[PDB]
Design a protein around this ligand. Structure first.
Ligand SMILES: *[C@@H]1O[C@H](CO)[C@@H](O)[C@H](O)[C@H]1NC(C)=O
Ligand SMILES: *[C@@H]1O[C@H](CO)[C@@H](O)[C@H](O)[C@H]1NC(C)=O
Length: 233
């Protein structure tokens, strides 16, 4: 069995560079399946879709395989000065137009991008798991602040609509981030408040596996152990 990872710099190998790393790099050792980390730094649901990265996964995925999709960090911004990643506002069939890189592009909503990808993978017999984005350093201000982005809910909404599984990666990460405290968590974010140090990337990975176990996600079948930190919910 093979597990494919689609995400951004918080999941990708080498994370955001400069000694940071993505959480996808710490799954292999707890799974009895091959893990392919196709996350790329700086990608949004739109950017990733347009670059044909979802297709590359669809071409190679075989029945029974797993696909984990997690975006959000790069999905915001303004289309006035299109950065190529910003999705169209809304949660449904909304459609935005914008000239990016010399092409009048048809831009969809965040849920729409995830839903289309989910359907594409389901069609190939693969098991799809949409995951909410990881949180930016909540202990950045010296005090713990829990303020999810709109993309956390949008991911849950996309899963329902597409009829696939959802894992609240956000909540499980923030949960232990709160337990770990100011000093510890802040060391996970050397450079900025998004890109985690290798030590932090591991914790974020553990958080995901804790969510899988607690919610009963199908991926638990290939878990080599169920002894992870924190408590359920
Ligand atoms: C892009 O296409 C839409 C609909 O086809 C059109 O209304 C819009 O004006 C186009 N954008 C530009 C900059 O031409
Ligand atoms: C939190 O930790 C940072 C970095 O370790 C430190 O500089 C800061 O003073 C701490 N803030 C509080 C309120 O404890």
């Amino acid at each position: 069995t093979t597990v494919y990872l689609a995400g951004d710099s918080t999941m990708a190998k080498n994370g955001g560079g400069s000694g940071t790393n993505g959480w996808g790099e710490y799954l292999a050792s707890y799974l009895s399946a091959t893990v392919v980390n196709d996350a790329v730094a700086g990608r949004s649901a739109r950017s990733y879709t347009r670059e044909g990265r979802f297709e590359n996964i669809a071409d190679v995925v075989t029945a029974g395989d797993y696909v984990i999709v997690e975006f959000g960090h790069n999905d915001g911004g303004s289309l006035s000065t299109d950065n190529g990643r910003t999705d169209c506002s809304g949660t449904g069939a909304e459609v935005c137009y914008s000239v990016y890189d010399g092409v009048n592009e048809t831009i969809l909503t965040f849920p729409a991008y995830l839903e289309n990808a989910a359907k594409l993978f389901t069609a190939k017999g693969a098991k799809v798991i949409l995951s909410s984005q990881t949180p930016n350093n909540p202990w950045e201000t010296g005090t713990f602040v829990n303020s999810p982005t709109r993309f956390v809910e949008y991911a849950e909404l996309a899963a329902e609509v597409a009829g696939v599984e959802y894992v609240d990666h956000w909540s499980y990460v923030d949960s232990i981030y709160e337990t770990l405290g100011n000093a510890t968590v802040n060391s996970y974010f050397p450079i900025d408040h998004t890109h985690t140090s290798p030590a932090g990337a591991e914790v974020v990975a553990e958080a995901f596996l804790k969510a899988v176990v607690c919610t009963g996600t199908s991926l638990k079948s290939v878990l080599t152990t169920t002894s992870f930190e924190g408590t359920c919910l």
